[PDB]
Amino acid sequence: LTRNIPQVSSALFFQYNQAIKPPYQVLIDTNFINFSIQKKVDIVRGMMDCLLAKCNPLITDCVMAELEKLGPKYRIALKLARDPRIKRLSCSHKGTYANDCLVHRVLQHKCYIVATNDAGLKQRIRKIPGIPLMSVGGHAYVIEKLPDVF
Amino acid sequence: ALRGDIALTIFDVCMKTLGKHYINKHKGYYAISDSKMNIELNKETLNYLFSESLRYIKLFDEFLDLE
Amino acid sequence: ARIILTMGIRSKASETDLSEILPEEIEERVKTAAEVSMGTEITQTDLDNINALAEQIVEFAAYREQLSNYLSARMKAIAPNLTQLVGELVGARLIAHSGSLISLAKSPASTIQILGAEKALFRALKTKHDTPKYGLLYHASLVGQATGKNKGK
Amino acid sequence: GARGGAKVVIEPHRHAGVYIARGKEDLLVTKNMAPGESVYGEKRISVEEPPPTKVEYRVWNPFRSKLAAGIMGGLDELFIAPGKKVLYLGAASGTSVSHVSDVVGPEGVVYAVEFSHRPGRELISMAKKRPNIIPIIEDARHPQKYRMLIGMVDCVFADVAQPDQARIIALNSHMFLKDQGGVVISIKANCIDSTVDAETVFAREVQKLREERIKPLEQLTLEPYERDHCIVVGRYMRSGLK
Amino acid sequence: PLFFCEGSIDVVSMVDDFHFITGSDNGNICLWSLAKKKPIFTERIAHGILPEPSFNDISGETDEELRKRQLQGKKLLQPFWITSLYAIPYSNVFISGSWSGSLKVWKISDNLRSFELLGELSGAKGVVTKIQVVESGKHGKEKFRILASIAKEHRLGRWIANVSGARNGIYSAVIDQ
Amino acid sequence: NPKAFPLADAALTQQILDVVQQAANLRQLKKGANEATKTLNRGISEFIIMAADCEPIEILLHLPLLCEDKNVPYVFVPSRVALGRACGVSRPVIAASITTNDASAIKTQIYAVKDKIETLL
Amino acid sequence: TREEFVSFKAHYGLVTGLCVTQPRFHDKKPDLKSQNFMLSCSDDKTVKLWSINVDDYSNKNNEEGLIRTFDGESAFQGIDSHRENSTFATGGAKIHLWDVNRLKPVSDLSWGADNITSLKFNQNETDILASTGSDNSIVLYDLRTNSPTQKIVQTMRTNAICWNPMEAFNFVTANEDHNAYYYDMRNLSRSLNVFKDHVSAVMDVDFSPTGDEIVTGSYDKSIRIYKTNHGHSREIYHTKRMQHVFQVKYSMDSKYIISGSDDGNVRLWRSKAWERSNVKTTREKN
Amino acid sequence: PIEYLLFEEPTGYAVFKVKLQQDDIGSRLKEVQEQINDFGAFTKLIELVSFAPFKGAAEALENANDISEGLVSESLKAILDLNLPKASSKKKNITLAISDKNLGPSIKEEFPYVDCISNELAQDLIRGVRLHGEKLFKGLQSGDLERAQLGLGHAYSRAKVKFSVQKNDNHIIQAIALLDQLDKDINTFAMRVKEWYGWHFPELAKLVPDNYTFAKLVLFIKDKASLNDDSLHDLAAGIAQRVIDNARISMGQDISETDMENVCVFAQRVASLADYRRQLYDYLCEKMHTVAPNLSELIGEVIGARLISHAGSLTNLSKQAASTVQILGAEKKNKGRISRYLANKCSMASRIDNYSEEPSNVFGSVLKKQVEQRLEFY
RNA sequence: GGAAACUCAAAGAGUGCUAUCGGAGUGCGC
Numbered sequence A: 001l002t003r004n005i006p007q008v009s010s011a012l013f014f015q016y017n018q019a020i021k022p023p024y025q026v027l028i029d030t031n032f033i034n035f036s037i038q039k040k041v042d043i044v045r046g047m048m049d050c051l052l053a054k055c056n057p058l059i060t061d062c063v064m065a066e067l068e069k070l071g072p073k074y075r076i077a078l079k080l081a082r083d084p085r086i087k088r089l090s091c092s093h094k095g096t097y098a099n100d101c102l103v104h105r106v107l108q109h110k111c112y113i114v115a116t117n118d119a120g121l122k123q124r125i126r127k128i129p130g131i132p133l134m135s136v137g138g139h140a141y142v143i144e145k146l147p148d149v150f
Numbered sequence B: 001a002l003r004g005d006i007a008l009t010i011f012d013v014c015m016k017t018l019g020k021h022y023i024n025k026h027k028g029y030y031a032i033s034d035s036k037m038n039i040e041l042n043k044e045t046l047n048y049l050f051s052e053s054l055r056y057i058k059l060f061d062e063f064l065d066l067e
Numbered sequence C: 001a002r003i004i005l006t007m008g009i010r011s012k013a014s015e016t017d018l019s020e021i022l023p024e025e026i027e028e029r030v031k032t033a034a035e036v037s038m039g040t041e042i043t044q045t046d047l048d049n050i051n052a053l054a055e056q057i058v059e060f061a062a063y064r065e066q067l068s069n070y071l072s073a074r075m076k077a078i079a080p081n082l083t084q085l086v087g088e089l090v091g092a093r094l095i096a097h098s099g100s101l102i103s104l105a106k107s108p109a110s111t112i113q114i115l116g117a118e119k120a121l122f123r124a125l126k127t128k129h130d131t132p133k134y135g136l137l138y139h140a141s142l143v144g145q146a147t148g149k150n151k152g153k
Numbered sequence D: 001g002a003r004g005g006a007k008v009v010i011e012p013h014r015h016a017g018v019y020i021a022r023g024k025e026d027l028l029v030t031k032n033m034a035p036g037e038s039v040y041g042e043k044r045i046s047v048e049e050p051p052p053t054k055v056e057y058r059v060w061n062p063f064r065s066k067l068a069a070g071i072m073g074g075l076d077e078l079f080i081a082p083g084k085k086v087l088y089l090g091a092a093s094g095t096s097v098s099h100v101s102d103v104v105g106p107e108g109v110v111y112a113v114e115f116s117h118r119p120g121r122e123l124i125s126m127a128k129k130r131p132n133i134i135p136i137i138e139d140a141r142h143p144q145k146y147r148m149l150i151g152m153v154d155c156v157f158a159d160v161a162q163p164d165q166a167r168i169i170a171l172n173s174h175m176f177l178k179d180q181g182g183v184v185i186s187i188k189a190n191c192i193d194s195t196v197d198a199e200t201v202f203a204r205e206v207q208k209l210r211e212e213r214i215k216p217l218e219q220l221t222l223e224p225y226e227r228d229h230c231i232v233v234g235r236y237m238r239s240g241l242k
Numbered sequence E: 001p002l003f004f005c006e007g008s009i010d011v012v013s014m015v016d017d018f019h020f021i022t023g024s025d026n027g028n029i030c031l032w033s034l035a036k037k038k039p040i041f042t043e044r045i046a047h048g049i050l051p052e053p054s055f056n057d058i059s060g061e062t063d064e065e066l067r068k069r070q071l072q073g074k075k076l077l078q079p080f081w082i083t084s085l086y087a088i089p090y091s092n093v094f095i096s097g098s099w100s101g102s103l104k105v106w107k108i109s110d111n112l113r114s115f116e117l118l119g120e121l122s123g124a125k126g127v128v129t130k131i132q133v134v135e136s137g138k139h140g141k142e143k144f145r146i147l148a149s150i151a152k153e154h155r156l157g158r159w160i161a162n163v164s165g166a167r168n169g170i171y172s173a174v175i176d177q
Numbered sequence F: 001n002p003k004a005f006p007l008a009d010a011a012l013t014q015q016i017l018d019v020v021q022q023a024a025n026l027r028q029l030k031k032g033a034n035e036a037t038k039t040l041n042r043g044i045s046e047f048i049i050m051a052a053d054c055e056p057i058e059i060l061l062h063l064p065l066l067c068e069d070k071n072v073p074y075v076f077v078p079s080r081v082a083l084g085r086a087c088g089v090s091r092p093v094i095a096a097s098i099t100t101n102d103a104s105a106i107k108t109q110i111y112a113v114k115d116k117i118e119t120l121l
Numbered sequence G: 001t002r003e004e005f006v007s008f009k010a011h012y013g014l015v016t017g018l019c020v021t022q023p024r025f026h027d028k029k030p031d032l033k034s035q036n037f038m039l040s041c042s043d044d045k046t047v048k049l050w051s052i053n054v055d056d057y058s059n060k061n062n063e064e065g066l067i068r069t070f071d072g073e074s075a076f077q078g079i080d081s082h083r084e085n086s087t088f089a090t091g092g093a094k095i096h097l098w099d100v101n102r103l104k105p106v107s108d109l110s111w112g113a114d115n116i117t118s119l120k121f122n123q124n125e126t127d128i129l130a131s132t133g134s135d136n137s138i139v140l141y142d143l144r145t146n147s148p149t150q151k152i153v154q155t156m157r158t159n160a161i162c163w164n165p166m167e168a169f170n171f172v173t174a175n176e177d178h179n180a181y182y183y184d185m186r187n188l189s190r191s192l193n194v195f196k197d198h199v200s201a202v203m204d205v206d207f208s209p210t211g212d213e214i215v216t217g218s219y220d221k222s223i224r225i226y227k228t229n230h231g232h233s234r235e236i237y238h239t240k241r242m243q244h245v246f247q248v249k250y251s252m253d254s255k256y257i258i259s260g261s262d263d264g265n266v267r268l269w270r271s272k273a274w275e276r277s278n279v280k281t282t283r284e285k286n
Numbered sequence H: 001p002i003e004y005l006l007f008e009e010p011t012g013y014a015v016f017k018v019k020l021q022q023d024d025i026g027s028r029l030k031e032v033q034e035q036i037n038d039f040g041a042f043t044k045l046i047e048l049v050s051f052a053p054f055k056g057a058a059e060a061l062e063n064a065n066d067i068s069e070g071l072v073s074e075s076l077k078a079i080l081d082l083n084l085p086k087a088s089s090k091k092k093n094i095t096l097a098i099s100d101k102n103l104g105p106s107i108k109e110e111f112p113y114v115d116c117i118s119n120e121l122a123q124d125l126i127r128g129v130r131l132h133g134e135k136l137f138k139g140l141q142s143g144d145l146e147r148a149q150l151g152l153g154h155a156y157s158r159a160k161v162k163f164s165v166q167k168n169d170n171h172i173i174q175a176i177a178l179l180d181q182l183d184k185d186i187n188t189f190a191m192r193v194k195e196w197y198g199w200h201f202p203e204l205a206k207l208v209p210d211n212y213t214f215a216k217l218v219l220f221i222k223d224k225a226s227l228n229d230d231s232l233h234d235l236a237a238g239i240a241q242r243v244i245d246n247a248r249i250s251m252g253q254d255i256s257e258t259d260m261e262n263v264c265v266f267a268q269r270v271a272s273l274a275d276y277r278r279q280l281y282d283y284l285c286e287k288m289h290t291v292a293p294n295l296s297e298l299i300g301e302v303i304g305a306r307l308i309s310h311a312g313s314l315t316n317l318s319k320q321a322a323s324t325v326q327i328l329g330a331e332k333k334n335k336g337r338i339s340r341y342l343a344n345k346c347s348m349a350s351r352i353d354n355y356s357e358e359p360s361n362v363f364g365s366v367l368k369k370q371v372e373q374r375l376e377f378y
Numbered sequence I: 001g002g003a004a005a006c007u008c009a010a011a012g013a014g015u016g017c018u019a020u021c022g023g024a025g026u027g028c029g030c
């Protein structure tokens, strides 16, 4: 009888997560792009101004499907998120739901940082241990649990 | 002009090609490398090749009517 | 042993084989196997050394045949009643297990029955099980003729 | 502990083919295909069976074999069953391919490829002993020049040490692996990228797999035996990826 | 045109208070000023190149073409080291030494920026571990005495590589005029 | 096609053997053929170096079959006496090895050397 | 494999029209079984002709992009390539006719000084062509006479014209009033059909190469498939994530329509929305 | 346009006419790429139209080498010249779905009217015919694919390695592991000859203790009736007189006959076994001199064969370190440092004569001189 | 309570099995 308890991924400390070297990989998602636009900050230069390090953004196919699905009010968001500076993942699961796609994607790798803004996703991300989220705030970004913010 | 040079050329190509392919029917995958074995298999293919050439002489002497 | 004594090397296997050995349907298999084989080649030194090995190992088999025929004839000479009843290759194991012929004759019918499987006998006695019934006589020619528990009786 | 002469029970494991050897301290043990000769110097259990016959078993030293550490750390399912055909990208020498061979058994085959030469002659000198393996001494980056001699393997496995790991396994699996078939790769982080660290390079490699149509399903890290490698198990979908 | 990088700088002498000479490992012998980080004149391989290991003691094989192809051509030829270098103080000529047997005495030119092979003394088979010069005479005529210490081991480690006929001694040469 | 194929040229020779001398002064080096193969089949070996002019060449040619099986780079050097002078020892050592240690201050030069010789091979 | 061969930053402004050619040069053999040629005109006065390396075959073993650049006086609005003898026509301020051995336009073929929104050549009787200009006008031209030949004026501006690859004298015409007209050429007084089911501007149409189905794609976020012989919609595709389909094309297999939205994607669709693509057994096909 | 396909197989070359076509645009769909997997639809798509088997094993290896470097050969060019039609220039040129772009230009060079193609359509069509394998060929062969590909793989691997098949240590392994067991078997069966001939002549185990000359004189004297011929016993063996008068004074005797005849058969066959030992030991002496001469000269021939047998193979002995050549019994303070010296010199000689291509004796001799100087240091 | 499946019926899974006027001539097609 096969039980399955996932081991704590061995590039993690107690909660320090030494696998997050300063060239970062972030996970952009949908209402974070929308709030970045309606707070009028940029994306790559905004992340650089918040983290003082070179950040590579990533968007998944599930989040791109959500951004296409949300209609023509966010054509600015879609034109911004088809940026050649960002990269793109490729998901393989059923149901384009950004929340469980994101939190599954990060809890089986523990190396991405999650750039989110909605309440349930922030709650699940800060529930699971040792991955940093960032969010919009005022006219800049804000990091929640990176060990070296400065 | 139209002598048996056709039959003689195809006899020559028969001799060298049947010798080579009898050697490659033996020595299956690995070219066997010892002096007396190579020499004795060359004697074996000389024996089989001349056993073919004597059959050529036999059912040509039955044919002859020519040069 | 006879096919290594006949072939020698695998290269000579295409133009010859005996038909007194490997009857009529393993012949083309061993010829195509010697055609497409994956082992290497050996020279005449180790060839004739393993040839002499094949000589000794075919002489062992012919001598074993001659010696078992000798054992049949000699048991028929010494104790012809027992080998007329049971069989020579069972009476020989009986006598040579019990030692002397006299010290096998001085033994009851029950232990002549169970003379072989005594270890299953004694572990079945010292635990609580049921003792066996054939032992060494099971390879005789008649308890194989019987069927069921008729071989026990 | 586990000296030569103790009596060890041989219990079967979940992955059919391998066995647990439970003594006073446990071992992982595969049933030897050619009895009587160890291949890289490992210890051998030797059981007797009843005409008395005697069959032997080899231990599986996880500090010197790759997938043994994944087996002992506990993978959900491999694809190396006792009947399948198994391709082995980056077969170094006998030291793991003999274990995969005698897991596979006398019916299935193991096609072991290798690029270097001196491990190639060691692999061939081992390969003459047991018959269920095929040694190939060709580069794993060119699966169109040993396409002549293999066909339609049922699970591939990968230990090659090159930074085009995903391209190697993608080309070999498109050329040879059947649909709904397994692919077990073993990434070495410090080998394929020295700059960025282990979890980032693992996520980049598994993203390259799910771009090359292998749907991954297991990631194990095998940390107490080797450092910073990982075993990534995947299926080859090709039809209905999601 | 077969040359190679510098391995080690080994021995020195000050010709004057504004130049000096270094005899390196790889056969380079270098005249330096006190003004430049670069050397002025780096003469190449000093005493020649060592003779290669022969075609019978390189690979233990039998066939001569295999034991000659294991020499890999000239690609493992190694230079004679400068074992000891010594200049006569405030003069033109300096003396080197190796286990090539021959004390090669160069001479610098009057513009103090080059030197050429003046002479070669083929008298001391062995490693030349240090070289001294003691002179006599008058203001005009000078009778110099090149002493050198000659051994069968280098003065730091053992490192005997192809030494033949080399006994522990003192090499004297009474050069004149 | 000789038996000592990855033979290093001059500048790469000089940088790998000053890394050798730094390792010998940092107590991170194993000197000699049989200690080299012992640390090689123990596993702690960043890379191993042989000398391509030992008078039997096979007494260190046995090291390729171990090292390229256990996936560790290996380099021939054209002088055993220069490698002895590099290791800082009287007699000429012909086969050196650098142990693995993440508490040693030549990790950067070791990795630069290892990348250069993996590109060389 | 649904992937891209190469990309190009082709121009600066809006790209306007591209088509592919097998362009027969005269000082060069047509190497059209190893590399494939496409050319594209934009509104920054350039018409670039490009090669593409393509592994359709494996004959050979390098001249990747930008074979040449025709440059024009005014802007450019569309092209299409005459499929014989390596000639191609463009539209802009007035329609021009180039071939790929000249940097200058070989001919100029307008009625008056009026811009031309789109063009199309035939699929047979190749030497004639049609175009549409923002005088709400359909023009025809004939290169054999090297002149325009007739001109009708509709009530709204024709966006995209498309010839029939089996009739050779019928074309469809997609204009901003919400109905694709279907004209016969040699009697241009009566639009012999009108396909009349949209709600917004009819942005593009194309014939299937089987010669009887029309794909159309509207300015409203929907595409429709018509038959020729009916005049109403057979059926309709739409999705939530496409907006303002601007270009639809049948594929040459005549089963797959390639639609391209304004969101960025180039989606594909089965024309028959229920016929699958596997080869089927004979009782199933029956 | 894919209408002919070429597949290469380890029994022969196959060429398939493509009856109908695959869906090109939807060629990533599930309902298309399961048709390659199932069989009832693949034979709707590909039929066999030619299959020429190369029949020579070496010609199969040569075809495999020419394909593996990407070059045409005689049988491939022969079947393409047979099967591929001359597509005349009015229609088209014929197309051929081959497996690799390295092979492509070498058939386009030879046949002008063919045109090779390998996109993913040719890739997965060849993948489908590789998956279905034998069930396409509908019986046009004699022999399955896997044993033939096993042989062809081993041959191709050895031809790539150019592995020296004269460096044979397995012969010495089996030689010494047969030799010691055969000495034990000769000794046991000679004890049986002694214990069986004791019933006929029990004062022979005292006089003639050697097993081989015991068996040979048991072959000489059948029954105790010799009594006169003294001039043959020094040949077959002074003690002649002892065995002659003990052939009449002893008479601890059973007079049995047929068992004496089988004793004679057994004794002459055990003598044959002794002759076989006395030649096999000399055989592996000279084979030790041929295969491993430096270690032979250093340590001795049978001690060397014992040491390679303990190691398992000569390559395994060489890749052992020089401190783990500790073996008990062999290499027989001042009694231990000489054995350590002999140990790592034996490992040095093992490295020389294994990793050489074919070894010499000069390094074994100078190794012998070095260790003898180290012994005379005492 | 153990079930002989060889009395028969209703059903469920796994495995294997197939294709889509007659010869010339005569105006003739490359």
Ligand SMILES: [Zn+2]
Residues within 6 Å of the ligand: A060, A061, A062, A063, A091, A092, A093, A096, A097, A101
């Ligand atoms: Zn997703």
